[PDB]
Scaffold this active site. Structure first.
Site, PDB file in Angstrom:
ATOM      1  N   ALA B  11       0.851  -1.234  -0.138  1.00 37.49           N
ATOM      2  CA  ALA B  11       0.002   0.059  -0.025  1.00 37.49           C
ATOM      3  C   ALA B  11       0.932   1.380  -0.025  1.00 37.49           C
ATOM      4  O   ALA B  11       0.755   2.100  -1.071  1.00 37.49           O
ATOM      5  CB  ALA B  11      -0.944  -0.036   1.223  1.00 37.49           C
ATOM      6  N   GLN B  14       2.620   1.477  -3.572  1.00 36.41           N
ATOM      7  CA  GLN B  14       2.027   1.928  -4.424  1.00 36.41           C
ATOM      8  C   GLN B  14       1.061   3.315  -4.544  1.00 36.41           C
ATOM      9  O   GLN B  14       0.926   3.948  -5.376  1.00 36.41           O
ATOM     10  CB  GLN B  14       0.935   0.811  -4.702  1.00 36.41           C
ATOM     11  N   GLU B  60       9.177  -8.299   0.309  1.00 41.46           N
ATOM     12  CA  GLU B  60       9.113  -8.978  -0.709  1.00 41.46           C
ATOM     13  C   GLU B  60       9.234  -8.202  -1.914  1.00 41.46           C
ATOM     14  O   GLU B  60       9.079  -6.858  -1.759  1.00 41.46           O
ATOM     15  CB  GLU B  60       7.574  -9.519  -0.923  1.00 41.46           C
ATOM     16  N   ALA B  88       6.135 -10.297   4.692  1.00 33.47           N
ATOM     17  CA  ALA B  88       5.989  -9.917   6.123  1.00 33.47           C
ATOM     18  C   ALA B  88       4.930 -10.920   6.887  1.00 33.47           C
ATOM     19  O   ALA B  88       4.786 -10.974   7.888  1.00 33.47           O
ATOM     20  CB  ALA B  88       5.304  -8.569   6.174  1.00 33.47           C
ATOM     21  N   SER B 129       0.506   0.953   5.184  1.00 37.63           N
ATOM     22  CA  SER B 129      -0.732   0.359   5.547  1.00 37.63           C
ATOM     23  C   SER B 129      -1.176   0.379   7.127  1.00 37.63           C
ATOM     24  O   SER B 129      -0.380   0.215   7.793  1.00 37.63           O
ATOM     25  CB  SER B 129      -1.329  -0.841   4.949  1.00 37.63           C
ATOM     26  N   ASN B 195     -10.221   3.416   3.438  1.00 37.23           N
ATOM     27  CA  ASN B 195     -10.336   2.677   1.879  1.00 37.23           C
ATOM     28  C   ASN B 195     -11.764   2.652   1.600  1.00 37.23           C
ATOM     29  O   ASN B 195     -12.200   2.466   0.525  1.00 37.23           O
ATOM     30  CB  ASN B 195      -9.741   1.249   2.058  1.00 37.23           C
ATOM     31  N   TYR B 213      -7.104  -0.755  -7.360  1.00 39.20           N
ATOM     32  CA  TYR B 213      -6.303  -0.032  -6.489  1.00 39.20           C
ATOM     33  C   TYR B 213      -5.937   1.107  -7.039  1.00 39.20           C
ATOM     34  O   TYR B 213      -5.797   2.254  -6.738  1.00 39.20           O
ATOM     35  CB  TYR B 213      -5.117  -0.962  -6.078  1.00 39.20           C
ATOM     36  N   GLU B 243       4.321  24.773  11.354  1.00 37.80           N
ATOM     37  CA  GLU B 243       3.464  25.630  10.981  1.00 37.80           C
ATOM     38  C   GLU B 243       2.311  25.010  10.266  1.00 37.80           C
ATOM     39  O   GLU B 243       1.530  25.430  10.160  1.00 37.80           O
ATOM     40  CB  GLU B 243       4.181  26.921  10.480  1.00 37.80           C
TER      41      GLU B 243
HETATM   42  N1  LIG Z   1      -5.414   2.529  -0.739  1.00 40.58           N
HETATM   43  C1  LIG Z   1      -4.834   1.280  -1.024  1.00 40.58           C
HETATM   44  N2  LIG Z   1      -4.911   0.521  -0.208  1.00 40.58           N
HETATM   45  C2  LIG Z   1      -3.990  -0.784  -0.379  1.00 40.58           C
HETATM   46  C3  LIG Z   1      -3.433  -0.782  -1.554  1.00 40.58           C
HETATM   47  N3  LIG Z   1      -2.590  -2.001  -1.631  1.00 40.58           N
HETATM   48  C4  LIG Z   1      -2.949  -2.658  -0.357  1.00 40.58           C
HETATM   49  N4  LIG Z   1      -3.878  -1.880   0.162  1.00 40.58           N
HETATM   50  C5  LIG Z   1      -4.399  -2.138   1.522  1.00 40.58           C
HETATM   51  O1  LIG Z   1      -3.596  -2.101   2.418  1.00 40.58           O
HETATM   52  C6  LIG Z   1      -3.833  -3.213   3.565  1.00 40.58           C
HETATM   53  C7  LIG Z   1      -2.855  -4.210   3.424  1.00 40.58           C
HETATM   54  O2  LIG Z   1      -1.715  -3.812   3.462  1.00 40.58           O
HETATM   55  P1  LIG Z   1      -0.490  -4.439   2.627  1.00 40.58           P
HETATM   56  O3  LIG Z   1       0.280  -3.479   1.714  1.00 40.58           O
HETATM   57  O4  LIG Z   1      -0.939  -5.518   1.510  1.00 40.58           O
HETATM   58  O5  LIG Z   1       0.499  -4.950   3.707  1.00 40.58           O
HETATM   59  P2  LIG Z   1       2.090  -4.936   3.510  1.00 40.58           P
HETATM   60  O6  LIG Z   1       2.886  -5.965   4.664  1.00 40.58           O
HETATM   61  O7  LIG Z   1       2.456  -3.663   3.770  1.00 40.58           O
HETATM   62  O8  LIG Z   1       2.361  -5.459   2.263  1.00 40.58           O
HETATM   63  P3  LIG Z   1       3.023  -7.071   1.814  1.00 40.58           P
HETATM   64  O9  LIG Z   1       4.185  -7.454   2.300  1.00 40.58           O
HETATM   65  O10 LIG Z   1       2.781  -7.107   0.258  1.00 40.58           O
HETATM   66  O11 LIG Z   1       1.911  -7.962   2.678  1.00 40.58           O
HETATM   67  C8  LIG Z   1      -5.357  -3.428   3.225  1.00 40.58           C
HETATM   68  O12 LIG Z   1      -5.877  -2.353   4.349  1.00 40.58           O
HETATM   69  C9  LIG Z   1      -5.558  -3.109   1.845  1.00 40.58           C
HETATM   70  O13 LIG Z   1      -6.978  -2.866   1.636  1.00 40.58           O
HETATM   71  C10 LIG Z   1      -3.190   0.263  -2.331  1.00 40.58           C
HETATM   72  O14 LIG Z   1      -2.478   0.339  -3.357  1.00 40.58           O
HETATM   73  N5  LIG Z   1      -3.997   1.215  -2.195  1.00 40.58           N
HETATM   74 MG   LIG Z   2       2.447  -8.179   4.419  1.00 38.78          MG
HETATM   75 MG   LIG Z   3       5.782  34.258   9.620  1.00 40.07          MG
END
Ligand SMILES: Nc1nc2c(ncn2[C@@H]2O[C@H](COP(=O)(O)OP(=O)(O)OP(=O)(O)O)[C@@H](O)[C@H]2O)c(=O)[nH]1
Ligand SMILES: [Mg+2]
Ligand SMILES: [Mg+2]
Ligand SMILES: Nc1nc2c(ncn2[C@@H]2O[C@H](COP(=O)(O)OP(=O)(O)OP(=O)(O)O)[C@@H](O)[C@H]2O)c(=O)[nH]1
Ligand SMILES: COc1cc2c(c(OC)c1OC)-c1ccc(OC)c(=O)cc1[C@@H](NC(=O)CS)CC2
Ligand SMILES: COc1cc2c(c(OC)c1OC)-c1ccc(OC)c(=O)cc1[C@@H](NC(=O)CS)CC2
Ligand SMILES: Nc1nc2c(ncn2[C@@H]2O[C@H](COP(=O)(O)OP(=O)(O)O)[C@@H](O)[C@H]2O)c(=O)[nH]1
Ligand SMILES: Nc1nc2c(ncn2[C@@H]2O[C@H](COP(=O)(O)OP(=O)(O)O)[C@@H](O)[C@H]2O)c(=O)[nH]1
Ligand SMILES: [Mg+2]
Lengths: 419, 421, 124, 427, 419
Positions: B11, B14, B60, B88, B129, B195, B213, B243
């Protein structure tokens, strides 16, 4: 990230052999040759199930184990016989068993090292090993006894990574041995302790699906394997294919098993035999369509995981998937929030334009354990055929110790139909 | 002066991938390389290129790999993209302890490699995230350590609060509570993004039956752009972090301001008075809830484009006449208005159209705590049976740390409610 | 009217004369005192010697503030640098112990098989 | 015999600047130096040419004195009789008398003694200073204290300028006046008060100037002063001795301030008009509209009258003018005191400045009277002071330099007393 | 006799910059060059506001201070950018503040010495130093916090000379920060203690003059400064010009401030925006025309000082000036005699044929202090944004100690509406 596949004992070998040739044609792989098929995806995560060797060639990351030649040479001179790596086969030669003891102590131990030493090669070759998955039967012994051993020895060398199994639990109908209940109980205990997830493929369920709902009179081991084989592709799809999830197989574990005691999944498939969507869900959530002799009614679902297949609109799926746990909203434990997740992939299976498969951690599975423990204590009562094991070196109380562990598993599942 | 962006986990990555692209389009930097002010976020490297002051980390490859693939491949340095082979697993316990420990030293050191070519750094903007493997775990650990190596320097987090439909994970609520606990005494101000709220806006407005996404991120991109903007252009609204926050958070308890984006309207001119009017509308928030219920303790209006204060004023006047003002007891009636003449540029093949003028409104309401409840309930109810706890104890966590964290969320929810009149 | 005037003095370019009109009818600056003046010096020099000893007073509370600041920060670092470290020691010891208890039970329902295969040597 | 003039602070300086110029014109001394004893009374025949005054000018900032060492008369003085002081008096007695004074007192005191040294038997000092006003009140007071130390007998004649709302004062003015007039009182022999409102007033009714300048006021004051001294510069009876000044006007040690009234003040342009009768100018002398301190003696009493004439005048008339000046007028003399009228005539005609606003006149009178009604001015000041002090109005600025709140009481305390004495002399 | 001019913090710097270029063209001075203009006077007291260097050149005796470059380079590349002496600018570089603490302790103290030691060179250069005047805002911090510091450090090195300031007190409308009330209160206290006279330029008043009486909708920081800038020239005229008064600036102090507590002046201007005399007075004595949000009605005047401008007859002025404190003779404290003094000078300002300005020590100023103390105690109640200061090293009770001092100031001004 990458998984090895152990496949042991007549049933296991046959079961997996169909698995292999089934996913191989999904990915477009020849008996030896590589790709051929206008699709492009396939290859992303082909990594996961195929260590690739010399030139083109694809060769699956598969280890073949047995305690009697026959069954192995059945594969070699068979479907995708040429596909597996030659010195990856591990023959037994000696007496089979069809008696747990033999496979988990005497004739078993004999081989173990020579197999373990070949899984060790495949594993250490892996760029980043995810874990192992094994196919075998719980009844009989050349895989229910060596298997439970093989795994007891994988953990210890690999506490790290996770243990996955597809285990065929046997029944009174369509069985070769009076002892199965002994062999079954003896393994169930072992599985409980050293595996993270185990899929239950009940043969009672299996037979029921062919004759009770498919007009198929004499069910071969053939059209029966076709069920398991199709189910197994459905269950792995998300780890071998797209770019929706990815499936750490550990993520799958951490998310499906709320309680340590490795909870056993009952699988289910959509269309069958050798499809509107509302029509597909209604079916995939039907007892008459589970891969284990149970009936989710007589028990709640802990967590459920469903994976669709084929060009269809998720707009409908997410809608129908909500409509099941509503017309049935009492059967989904309410102490675990969004406990039913659905994944869609757009590459159709064999034949089938549309397809779905289902993974369910349900307390109804209790029903299955109870019925094998029913023929067990029903024989171990007045110590039945027991002298066949006593003799191979086992102790009398190693049976009570297994039985006792097993009934608890029932007394725990039955504890979680709480509130 | 300067300003480092850190994106940790899927998240995180991206989201940033999409707002670093809106950044480029805003400042006109052809992906390849080149075209102060613009310097707040970029370091004029080589005798051509423009490169971001960012670091991307995931446990990953996968996600990061697509970055070193699609255009923008050239845009970064190979070093600022850290990747980690082993996943993770989806549990804070792994990201914060087991699997993290191994990559922390390598990240920590590289971000310092970035801060070294920065005469008087300012702080870090971190995107991650809420639930989610490394998003919760690693983040928490990063922040602990960033506080050790960077005393003063502020930390601004951009968190993604999870929602049932844009697929979560059963264990999500544990993770969220978990990170938000450790992470709280170390952030200065955080921007939560529901989200469900974004999925929601893409439906009522963009009219997409199945929001991707890549569809959500684009929109979030914009909200973020409008947030930073001020300190990228430069002499306008919320100058030099400090500020910025000195404006929203009245209490050390890291306050999470509520963000509301102006006119979201699909491709294929809205009045100055109208978009302001759409800012005090629940259906257009960033965190599903409603402040016609709670109270406001600091309002902010961040405009962009063609706008004279003469209107912004008359729009405010009428925005109070027939509305739910509801300001809190001991706090003026804020409205630090900031206009940033530079027009709102949007992505070319995007789903939103060019717009003459857009607003931002960052408010610190008590009703944002309605989200801290929705999460606690999920957590509380699962923990009632140690639902999945054993996976965490497994990596080496204490059952106590679960109590000790919810214990803070019990407290926070109290503080929030305590600020009321 | 009826005046009669007497005349005291007649100069070269002058003449003074008084004219009585009617019978009226009736019947140390100290030198030392420059000490008064130099008492004011030693009172003004006081006034200023004050709002000075009273000003360098503010000064060394400015040192104190710049100080409770830097020392405020220190005790955030060197208190939450070892709040992390002695918790990521709680961690290593815990898992290493969890993974060591998981082999302990495993290497024993292993060294039991070996010891009860050596029972099939005395048995069969 | 001799006679030193001292001018301290702006008003003091500028007033003397204009009466040292009328002096020159009277005795015909071309600015630079000499003319192509008598007037030795005021000048010391220095060098084998020059005529130079016996004066000292002191101010606590340059500005004023600097303009003296600029405009003609630049040569007239010695560089040393012009003392100047860089840092200002600030407008509060407390500074002039204590803080800023101390620093320059030793240098002034010594130079005036450098002047008194070439004087075989000095007579006393004529001192010109402002009433309110920084160094005018402050430094003056301090000078006089010490002058009394170094010159025991020798008389001190002050020419004070009593302040008035319109010819711009300063808010604190009344404090300053009361303050100086206190310390300074037990040290002066006789003082001549000059109300700025009276002079502003005369310039309006007579010279017809809508906006009277300082330079306009001073010229007029110049004349009154000339007529006062005169007597002892040309030598010819009546006040030919500083002693004889007090002996004729002050009956009581309480430094009495005589009331001065100048004869005919009439603007050039009206110059070639008709010569004013000897009887008439005397008649204009008993007229409030022509005083030097705004008030009125048709109210109080007289305890010593003096007539000082100048020009073409025989006593024979001065008499018949007095006779008729008594017949239909307010004589009102006080109980235990003759009916004075020490008349003095000084044949030498009244010369006036060339580009001036007043014309040459055939004959002029002076009249110095010590009335009880002059205390009406001591009241007007007290009220202002009393009413401000009722709230420590600006007192803190004085306590600031190092004064006691007590010295404020102790001084008003004398003014309460004086106003009593004045009234007490009535019948 | 001669004064130095410190000018610090974005507002101060901007405000003063207009002051400078406004008086410079009054005196006839080029961006660098010297005189040009058929007038002759100008130069007498040019001394007072301009230390003059190499060749012709005039260079003002000005020190420029701030804690962030920008605002300074705004001047350099601006109006009379070239006029100021290069190493007279003192950059900050680091974080600004907009938080008092930072400017009066941490980021502040950092610079102090480097400024203090540049005022030290300008001062000791002076032939006879009169005192310092500083321009800055009371809200915000790089000048309200460093400023109040700079001055606390000027007294100590210069008890001697007097401290003069033009301080813009802030309001709820036309403000960038929620904290202003904290910053303001914190300085007010400081001003009370170490300055002899302080002119209050209220921004609330300022905004009111542009829109409430001058059809000017969006009031820039620009046409707003134009007011302050014109007012400031009016206030100083008498010390930079004629030979009527001369103005010891100390004389101005000793005469305008009856009570130690440095009493704050509310200024007022005659004609305005970017004139008969009776018409000019009627205006210069109107609330609708004061530079501070007050209303002399709700309070008596302690002392007033007015300074006219342009070829006009004082005969009329003295007459009209008496006619104000008559039709309004109740609003001039009667325990201070001739407490209203008027000065006239005949060199017209910018445009304007006729002009007047007004300085007023009025107990109505109480109203202003009360309204900032209203938003202060209204926030410090439930300790608001306070943690922003606690953090930079300040103590909780240093706020109460300031609030307490300030309310007394109200309780004293309200004490002198006596009799
Ligand atoms: N807004 C938004 N939410 C995302 C996106 N990708 C994953 N999520 C959300 O992020 C959360 C999961 O987080 P992840 O990014 O998959 O977890 P991470 O451990 O940081 O990444 P991984 O190592 O791939 O598991 C859930 O709330 C998903 O809905 C994205 O591209 N945009
Ligand atoms: Mg993860
Ligand atoms: Mg000032
Ligand atoms: N008649 C007359 N009065 C003057 C003159 N100059 C000043 N004054 C008055 O003197 C009083 C102020 O006294 P200053 O001479 O200015 O005080 P100072 O301290 O002696 O002079 P500075 O040191 O320059 O301040 C006010 O009452 C003025 O009206 C003048 O030239 N003629
Ligand atoms: C083998 O590949 C699978 C891998 C996983 C899941 C799964 O079931 C849908 C799989 O198919 C059998 C999975 C599972 C379970 C969940 O809870 C029931 C969940 O929330 C989530 C998931 C899957 N993830 C998601 O849905 C993330 S939005 C990831 C783990
Ligand atoms: C900066 O220059 C100024 C300096 C001063 C005064 C003044 O008027 C307000 C000035 O203009 C701004 C001044 C002030 C006020 C008085 O009391 C209200 C006073 O009596 C007297 C004055 C001025 N003195 C006089 O008017 C005596 S003529 C001197 C001090
Ligand atoms: N469906 C499936 N089940 C089988 C197959 N073969 C045997 N079984 C079941 O599995 C049990 C034991 O299998 P078996 O292969 O003979 O045991 P092994 O000696 O361990 O290889 C039997 O009791 C059957 O119920 C097979 O071909 N497919
Ligand atoms: N009138 C005037 N006031 C200003 C100006 N700029 C800022 N201010 C006021 O001063 C306050 C803060 O001053 P600022 O200069 O931004 O803080 P600094 O960093 O201390 O210099 C704000 O609340 C403004 O109302 C200006 O240009 N002119
Ligand atoms: Mg003076």
């Amino acid at each position: 990230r990458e998984i090895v596949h152990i496949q042991a004992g007549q049933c296991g070998n046959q079961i997996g052999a169909k698995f292999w040739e089934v996913i191989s044609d999904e990915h477009g792989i020849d008996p030896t040759g590589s790709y051929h098929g206008d699709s492009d995806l396939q290859l992303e995560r082909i990594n996961v199930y195929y260590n690739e060797a010399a030139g083109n060639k694809y060769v699956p990351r598969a280890i073949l184990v047995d305690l009697e030649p026959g069954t192995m040479d059945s594969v070699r001179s068979g479907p995708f016989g040429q596909i597996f790596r030659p010195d990856n086969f591990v023959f037994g030669q000696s007496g089979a068993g069809n008696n747990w003891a033999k496979g988990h102590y005497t004739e078993g131990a004999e081989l173990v090292d020579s197999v373990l030493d070949v899984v060790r090669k495949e594993s250490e070759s892996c760029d980043c090993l995810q874990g192992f998955q094994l196919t075998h039967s719980l009844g009989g012994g050349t895989g229910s006894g060596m298997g439970t051993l093989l795994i007891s020895k994988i953990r210890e060398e690999y506490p790290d990574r996770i243990m996955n199994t597809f285990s065929v639990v046997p029944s009174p109908k369509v069985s070769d041995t009076v002892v199965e209940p002994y062999n079954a109980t003896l393994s169930v205990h072992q599985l409980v302790e050293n595996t993270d997830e185990t899929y239950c493929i009940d043969n009672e369920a299996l037979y029921d699906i062919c004759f009770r709902t498919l007009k198929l009179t004499t069910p071969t081991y053939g059209d029966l394997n076709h069920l398991v084989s199709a189910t197994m592709s459905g269950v792995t799809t998300c780890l071998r294919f797209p770019g929706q999830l990815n499936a750490d197989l550990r993520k799958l574990a951490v998310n499906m098993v709320p309680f340590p005691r490795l909870h056993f999944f009952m699988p289910g498939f959509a269309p069958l035999t050798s499809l509107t969507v509302p029509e597909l869900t209604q079916q995939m959530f039907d007892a008459k369509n589970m891969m284990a002799a149970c009936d989710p009614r007589h028990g709640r679902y802990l967590t459920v995981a469903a994976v669709f297949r084929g060009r269809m609109s998720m707009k409908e799926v997410d809608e129908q998937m909500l409509n099941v746990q509503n017309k049935n909203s009492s059967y989904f434990v309410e102490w675990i929030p969004n406990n039913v997740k659905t994944a869609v992939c757009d590459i159709p299976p064999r034949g089938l334009k549309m397809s779905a498969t289902f993974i369910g951690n349900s307390t109804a599975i209790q029903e299955l354990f109870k019925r094998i423990s029913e023929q067990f204590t029903a024989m171990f009562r007045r110590k039945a055929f027991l002298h066949w094991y006593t003799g191979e070196g086992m102790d009398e109380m190693e049976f009570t110790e297994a039985e006792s562990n097993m009934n608890d598993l029932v007394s725990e599942y039955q504890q979680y139909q709480d509130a | 002066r300067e300003c480092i962006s850190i994106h940790v986990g899927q998240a995180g990555v991206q989201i940033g991938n999409a707002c670093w692209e809106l950044y480029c389009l805003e400042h006109g930097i052809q992906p390849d390389g080149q075209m102060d002010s613009f310097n707040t976020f970029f370091s004029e490297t080589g005798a051509g290129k423009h490169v971001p002051r960012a670091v991307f980390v995931d446990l990953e490859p996968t996600v990061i790999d697509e970055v070193r693939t699609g255009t923008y491949r050239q845009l970064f340095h190979p070093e600022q993209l850290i990747t980690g082979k082993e996943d993770a697993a989806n549990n804070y316990a792994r990201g914060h302890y087991t699997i993290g420990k191994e990559i922390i030293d390598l990240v920590l050191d590289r971000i310092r490699k970035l801060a070294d070519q920065c005469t008087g750094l300012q702080g870090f903007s971190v995107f991650h995230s809420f639930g989610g493997g490394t998003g919760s775990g690693f983040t928490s650990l990063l922040m602990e350590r960033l506080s050790v190596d960077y005393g003063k320097k502020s930390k601004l987090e951009f968190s993604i609060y999870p929602a049932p439909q844009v697929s979560t994970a059963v264990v999500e609520p544990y993770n969220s509570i978990l990170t938000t606990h450790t992470t709280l005494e170390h952030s200065d101000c955080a921007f939560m993004v529901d989200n469900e709220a974004i999925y929601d806006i893409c439906r009522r407005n963009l009219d997409i039956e199945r929001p991707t996404y890549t569809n959500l991120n684009r929109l979030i991109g914009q909200i973020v752009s409008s947030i930073t903007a001020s300190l990228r252009f430069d002499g306008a609204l919320n100058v030099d972090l400090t500020e910025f926050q000195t404006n929203l958070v009245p209490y050390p308890r890291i306050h999470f301001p509520l963000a509301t984006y102006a006119p979201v309207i699909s491709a294929e001119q809205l009045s100055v008075a109208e978009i302001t009017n759409a800012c005090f509308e629940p259906a257009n928030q960033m965190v599903k809830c409603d402040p016609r219920h709670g109270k406001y303790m600091a309002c902010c209006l961040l405009y962009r484009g063609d706008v004279v204060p003469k209107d912004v004023n008359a729009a405010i006047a009428t925005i109070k006449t027939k509305r739910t003002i509801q300001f809190v007891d001991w706090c003026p009636t804020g409205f630090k208005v900031g206009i940033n003449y530079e027009p709102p540029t949007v992505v070319p093949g995007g789903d939103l159209a060019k717009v003459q003028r857009a607003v931002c409104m960052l408010s610190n309401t008590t009703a944002i705590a309605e989200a801290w409840a929705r999460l606690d309930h999920k957590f509380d109810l699962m923990y009632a049976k140690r639902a999945f706890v054993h996976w965490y104890v497994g990596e080496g966590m204490e059952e106590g740390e679960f109590s000790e964290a919810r214990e803070d969320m019990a407290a926070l929810e109290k503080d929030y409610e305590e600020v009321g009149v | 009217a009826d005046m009669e005037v007497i005349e005291l003095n007649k100069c070269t370019s002058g003449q003074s004369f008084e004219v009585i009109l009617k019978p009226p009818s009736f019947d140390p600056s100290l030198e030392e005192i420059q000490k008064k003046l130099e008492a004011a010096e030693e009172r003004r020099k006081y006034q200023e010697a004050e709002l000075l000893k009273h000003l360098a007073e503010k000064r060394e509370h400015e040192r104190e503030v710049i100080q409770k600041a830097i020392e405020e920060n220190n005790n955030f670092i060197k208190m939450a640098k070892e709040k992390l470290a002695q918790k990521m020691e709680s961690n290593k010891e815990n898992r290493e112990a969890h993974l060591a208890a998981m082999l302990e039970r495993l290497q024993e329902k292993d060294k039991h098989a070996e010891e009860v295969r050596k029972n099939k040597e005395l048995k069969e």
